[PDB]
């Protein structure tokens, strides 16, 4: 079945503003989708709802098998275990080695010695930074920081990866590197939802395009174009 199912989802903030006005999106496993649209359209409310940070007021929403309306807050961490989140403002722990930044998310859930150092070296190979396993974050470039952040978000192998403007703070070439890493992640099966306003990326790296405008899905196309300024 669908890994993300959103039907007639309404999100009203307490100040009367309605960020989502009955949005319906169906995402199969392994899909790679861009979330585009003018600012204030509700892109980030859309994605924030996908890991239960935002609670919807009306409609149905299920992510990775979890009914997000009925999920108990005590279970949201279990939801996050299947739903990794990458941010614009990549922020690693500064007094921790690259290895420790990645290993923390596995130590939390109590993974044993064996799987931790194996899994950390694996994801370090994926992001191509195993040669900096013992470096701290600020000897790392910006693009390298976002790559380690992405490694952290996928260390527990989540089924879904929500990326809010992953390249928003990176120059063109480092953004291509982030997109290539996201692509290889997607090819391994991870469903990737990427909110973005980089039209070059969207138009060269053709994937599904979900365009939101004034809280409503205005466009949902295979290998679509960016379609904005
Ligand atoms: N915490 C909040 N309280 C009230 N209104 C909010 C809140 N967060 C966002 N909004 C409003 O919801 C709408 C969508 O915002 P947002 O989801 O951040 O849009 P986008 O990500 O497309 O820029 C805007 O009108 C914004 O002002």
Residue numbers in the entry: 1 to 229
What does the paper say about this structure?
FtsEX is a membrane complex widely conserved across diverse bacterial genera and involved in critical processes such as recruitment of division proteins and in spatial and temporal regulation of muralytic activity during cell division or sporulation. The component FtsX is an integral membrane protein, whereas FtsE is an ATPase and is required for the transmission of a conformational signal from the cytosol through the membrane to regulate the activity of cell wall hydrolases in the periplasm. Here, we provide the first three-dimensional (3D) structure of FtsE from the notorious pathogen S. pneumoniae, and we show that it presents all the conserved structural motifs of the NBD members of the ABC transporter family. The nucleotide-binding site is located in lobe I near the interface between the two lobes and presents the nucleotide sandwiched between the Walker A and B motifs.
FtsE was crystallized with ADP in two different crystal forms (P 1 and P 21) and with AMP-PNP, a nonhydrolyzable analog of ATP, in the space group P 21. The FtsE–AMP-PNP complex was obtained by soaking with the P 21 FtsE-ADP crystals. The ATP analog was found in two out of the three independent monomers of the P 21 crystal. Structural comparison between our ADP and AMP-PNP complexes revealed that there were no relevant structural rearrangements directly associated with AMP-PNP binding, e.g., monomer M2 in complex with ADP and that in complex with AMP-PNP were nearly identical (RMSD of 0.22 Å for 223 Cα atoms). In the presence of AMP-PNP, K43 interacts with both the β- and γ-phosphates. The γ-phosphate is further stabilized by a direct interaction with the switch histidine (H197) and with S39. The catalytic glutamate (E165) is positioned directly adjacent to the γ-phosphate, consistent with a role in ATP hydrolysis. In conclusion, the residues that recognize the ATP molecule are properly oriented, and no relevant changes were required for nucleotide exchange. Other conclusions can be drawn from our structures; in particular, we have observed that while the relaxed structure of the FtsE-ADP complex nicely fits the equivalent complex in the MacB dimer; the monomer of the FtsE–AMP-PNP complex requires rigid-body adjustment of some regions around the central β-sheet in order to get a perfect fit with the more compact structure of the MacB-ATP dimer. For instance, in our FtsE–AMP-PNP complex, the γ-phosphate is far from the Q88 residue of the Q-loop (>6 Å); however, our composite model for the same structure in the dimer indicates that Q88 would directly recognize the γ-phosphate, as also occurs in the structure of the MacB-ATP dimer.
